Every structure is written in C-alpha cells, then in structure tokens.
Amino acid sequence: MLNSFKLSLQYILPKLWLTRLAGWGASKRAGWLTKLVIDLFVKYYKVDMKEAQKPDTASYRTFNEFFVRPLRDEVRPIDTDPNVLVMPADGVISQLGKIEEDKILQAKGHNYSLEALLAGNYLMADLFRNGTFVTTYLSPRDYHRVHMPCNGILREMIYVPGDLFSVNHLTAQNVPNLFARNERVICLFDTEFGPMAQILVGATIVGSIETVWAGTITPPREGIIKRWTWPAGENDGSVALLKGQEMGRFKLG
Amino acid sequence: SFKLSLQYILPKLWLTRLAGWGASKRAGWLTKLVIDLFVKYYKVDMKEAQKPDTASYRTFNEFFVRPLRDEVRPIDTDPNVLVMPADGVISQLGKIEEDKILQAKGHNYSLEALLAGNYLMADLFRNGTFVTTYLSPRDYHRVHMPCNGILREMIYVPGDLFSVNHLTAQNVPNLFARNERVICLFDTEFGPMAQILVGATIVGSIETVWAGTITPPREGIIKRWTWPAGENDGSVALLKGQEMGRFKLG
Amino acid sequence: XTVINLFAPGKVNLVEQLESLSVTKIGQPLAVST
Amino acid sequence: XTVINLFAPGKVNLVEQLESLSVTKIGQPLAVST
Ligand SMILES: CCCCCCCCCCCCO[C@@H]1O[C@H](CO)[C@@H](O[C@H]2O[C@H](CO)[C@@H](O)[C@H](O)[C@H]2O)[C@H](O)[C@H]1O
Ligand code: NA
Ligand code: NA
C-alpha cells in the first residue's frame, strides 16, 4: 500500500458535494467577485487570453462562461489531408498506442479493461479490441470544448455514472480503473476509418459534460446508465458532424 | 424528510466499511454482546437457527449469515412450483410493463437501468414478471434458488448504498437501479430467470456459492462472468431451494 | 437487503394471494408454470 | 478533463512523434488512415 496523504484525500474528500458547490459558484453572476476569481485563475494557471474570442476577463458574466470560452477560429486551423484525423482537444497526451487485446494503458505499467471503460458493453468492446487509443488530459488553463477528429455519423451515446476522482500522475499511477470508474459520456460514430469512440471523462470539480446534440448530460446525476441511439447516415433522424467541429465540452458542477 | 436528506449527506460507504471491519472481528465477549443486543432490539428468532447459542458465533457476520435448521424451511415438492428465494416481505411484484418495474405507488424504474444498460438481457424480460423481496435485519440473510437453474451469466454492478425502506422506496428515484448489486441469470425449465441481490447501507457485502464474496472489494467497474449450457465442463447447476448466495455487513 | 427475480413473458403465474407486504419464507410457493 | 479516443484494429496509425506529455492542439495531426 502507498501511504500518501494526497492519495487518501481522493478517498476521504466529499468529491461530489465539492463539485456541486463549485458548480453553484461557477454559475453565479457575481460581478467584481466573478472577475476577481477569473483573474486569480488566469494568473495562477497561466491562461492565454489572446487565443480567446473575448480576451477581456470582464466580458464573462459567470466563471463557467469563462471556463467554456470560445477561441478565435484562426488559432486552431484544421489539417486539410482527409486521411488525417486531428486532435479533438487542447492539452497533453496522457497515454496512447495499441489496445493490447482488452488492455489500455492508464500509466507506465498500469492497464485497465476496454470493456470496463465501456461500462461492460462487450459488443462495443468487440469493435475496438486490438485497436488504437489516445487519452488527452485537458488542464485548467486549456480550452474546455472538444471537437471532432474526423467526419462522423453519431450512432450511440452512453451516460455512465461514476466517481469524480482527480486526474493527475498520482491518481493515474495509484487509482485502479481511474477512467473506467469516473463519470463519463461515451460517443460512438461511424467514420471513413471505421467505428470511432470519443469518451468525455469527468473529474473532481470539472464534473459537468455537454454534447452539441443533447446539451448538458450531467448534472443532474440520476445514478443510472442511459443509452441513446441514432440511425445510419443515409436515414432520417441521423446526426452528422464534420472534422474539427465542436461536439461537446466540460464545465464546473 | 430530515431522514431522507441524511440518505444524501451520510458517508454510506465509509459507515458500511466500518460495520464490515467490526462484524469481521473475532471479539469474544464484545461480539456476543453486540449479537445479543441485535437479537433483543430486532426480535430475532434463534429457535430457527442450527446453533441457537449466540456464544457459538466467533464474528457478528457469522451470526448475520447464520444457517437455519432444514426442518423449518420445507421446500415445496411440485416441480411446476417456483418457491420464495428469501425470508422477508414482498416489496412489489407483478407485470413488467414493457421496460417499467414498480418501485412504489407512482414510481417506476427501467428494466434496462436495473440491468446496467444490458439491452440484450432486458430483451429477455420485457413484458415479463418481477418480484422484489425485502430482507429485514431480523430475517435469515442467505438467498436460495426459486427453481432448478443452470447459471449462465453474473454481472457485478457498482453503485450507491442507499437504505431500503418505505421512505426511500417512495422517495429515492431509481433506488434498485442505482444501488450496488449482483445480477445472476439462469437457464430454467420456465425460461430465462434473473435473481438480483441488491445491497444497502451497512448490509453491503454480497456472496454467491460459486464465487464467494463478490463485494467487497469495490473496484468501481462492471464485471461480467459467463458459464456454459448445462451438462458441459465448467457448468454450474443449482437445485430448487438450494443456497445460491447471501448478504453480510461490509 | 433486496432480492429481485425476473421471469420471461408468459412463463409463470405469481400465486394470487401475494401482494405488497406479504410475508415470504424460503421454500413456500412464489409462482407456477403456465 | 479527459478525452479518450478508440479506433478499430488496422484502421489508423498514430503520428509517430506523439508520446506521453506531447502538447495537443485542436486541428493538429493525431493519426493517419492505413
Ligand atoms: C469557482 C467558482 C467561483 C466563482 C466566483 C463567484 C462565486 C461567489 C458566489 C457569491 C454569490 C453572488 O450572488 C450574486 O449576487 C449578485 C448581486 O450583484 C446578483 O446579481 C443579479 O441578480 C440580482 C437579484 O438576484 C439582481 O438584483 C442583479 O441586478 C443581477 O445582476 C446575482 O444574480 C447573484 O447570483
Ligand atoms: Na461565477
Ligand atoms: Na448532481
């Protein structure tokens, strides 16, 4: 057993109540106090406001409005090779590479189950066994909207209740099944490159997840798995998104 | 209403682990004292137990899962009769109305949600029949087969540890679909059958006779096991009224 | 705790006397084949 | 936070320069069709 005060807090702290408290505060129009918290955040996390459509911190009525701020289009050019899939999110690669049968790397030496990440959906896991994975970590300073790696027809979305562990080197190394046990939304697309999943995983504080087709998925937190399906692209009622288009976002609460 | 608010405030999982730690201790006189207080307050009938002597239990959990004398639970002998799997009271029973199961007057929950989004398993039971049995602290806490069954699938589902009582049954949405539970799916002469063991605050530990203790530990993921059809190598078969699992503290 | 049983459509009839708060005992009749 | 992508076997090659802690920016190359 690792004897680590910081790790033990992950298991002791009322992570859900702290996330709800932060969501309450982040939704408030608090004028000078909103601007103060945003300025402290911008300073401490070294946010680059020059990439934002509205670089002025006074232009945000709520902390959440600031957290989900849009970027100027010019600053994220979408690669034009149609054979190229692009990064869906600003931040850093956590881990990437081969799915070794059912195994995805969480940290050097630490694996978790593809089937567990997909909430026990063995039919969906069958699509990705021996495939490829990319895990991108978005930090507090990064843009918090998520865009498409390629053209996609949405086929399935799954809301998975779970925990709100923090994501950092300590939890990646010491919390088993970190990404398979945290509240998440699974999105499954038909693409030119075959089936593709884009999974948005919550963390402490940053526990609210949206998609562009369904709005805010969480909160509220009703404690059950929810499944939506859409038809193939040639059919009425289909949802299609283009490479580099916004598909969802994270915010506080 | 104060009591309802506590369901959402109380550290249900830490209280469950505290109770599990205490209930697993071979604590001699203190084990026997807690057992005697419990027996007194909940009006337990020790005459039905194989060992009516409360000193014969080395741990509170040994007492909680105490076996009954066979004589006191005669198993119906009509092979066309399915029997009660547990001592307690019916919570609700009847028709699964498409995907809908009744939790309490005016509250439904989803068959697919109870089965953790397993739509292929939900398809077996749409428009079928359900029975929900509540086991109280005073009841026997092992669970027995309603009929002969070949075990085909078991699913461990992480979840909450809400208390189960009239107040939470009436007021907590999705109570049974959000609590930690084990789903057991059987081949029977009466078609597919599910027996689902749902945990609650304190009484959070679930065992089967084929797997031992499923929970704890609580590793936060869905786990699925499968078994072959009957009369194959690796097959697990249980008879009507045979023990298939139990609940204990922790 | 709680035990939930599910049966496939048209396979069993619940013994008609059982309702909310009926006492259950292991080995007593719950349902009959159709 | 975290975004996880899964791709089917034989379908994409990850850009070879990317590793743990590589900076990601929306629109930049992630993978190439096989
Ligand atoms: C990480 C999260 C931290 C984010 C920073 C801010 C959190 C602080 C929480 C303190 C609560 C502030 O509460 C906020 O007060 C101002 C008063 O100017 C209100 O101001 C607004 O509503 C009031 C009435 O409700 C109107 O009279 C007012 O004209 C209107 O602009 C906000 O509607 C209220 O939401
Ligand atoms: Na705010
Ligand atoms: Na919530």
Numbering used by the authors:
A (entry chain A): 1 to 253
B (entry chain C): 4 to 253
C (entry chain D), D (entry chain B): 254 to 287
What is written in the article reporting this PDB entry?
Phosphatidylethanolamine (PE), a major component of the cellular membrane across all domains of life, is synthesized exclusively by membrane-anchored phosphatidylserine decarboxylase (PSD) in most bacteria. PSD is translated as an inactive proenzyme and undergoes self-cleavage between a conserved Gly-Ser pair to become an active αβ-heterodimer. This maturation step results in the post-translational modification of the N-terminus serine to pyruvoyl in the α-subunit, which is an indispensable prosthetic group for decarboxylation activity. After the proenzyme undergoes auto-proteolysis, an active complex is formed between the α- and β-chains, which are mainly responsible for catalytic activity and membrane association, respectively.
Using native and selenomethionine-derivatized recombinant PSD1–287, the crystal structures of apo PSD1–287 were determined from two crystal forms at resolutions of 1.90 and 2.63 Å, which are described as Apo-PSD1 and Apo-PSD2, respectively. The asymmetric unit of Apo-PSD1 contains two αβ-heterodimers, whereas that of Apo-PSD2 contains four. Two out of three molecules of N-dodecyl-b-maltoside (DDM), a detergent used to solubilize the enzyme, were located at the interface between two adjacent β-subunits, augmenting the dimerization of αβ-heterodimers in Apo-PSD1. Interestingly, DDM molecules identified in the structure of Apo-PSD1 interact with the positively charged surface of PSD through the relatively polar disaccharide moiety, whereas the dodecyl tail of the detergent interacts with the hydrophobic surface of the enzyme encompassing the N-terminal helices. These molecular interactions may mimic those occurring on the cellular membranes, where PSD is partially embedded within a single layer of phospholipids using the N-terminal helical domain. Estimation of the protein-membrane border in bacterial cells is further aided by co-crystallized DDM, the length of which roughly encompasses a single membrane leaflet. The N-terminal pyruvoyl residue (Pvl-254) of the α-subunit was unambiguously identified in both apo structures. Gly-253 of the β subunit, which is no longer connected to Pvl-254 after auto-cleavage, is approximately 12.6 Å apart when the distance between two Cαs is measured, and it forms a salt bridge with the side chain of Arg-221. Consequently, Pvl-254, which is located at the base of the funnel-shaped active site, is open for substrate binding.
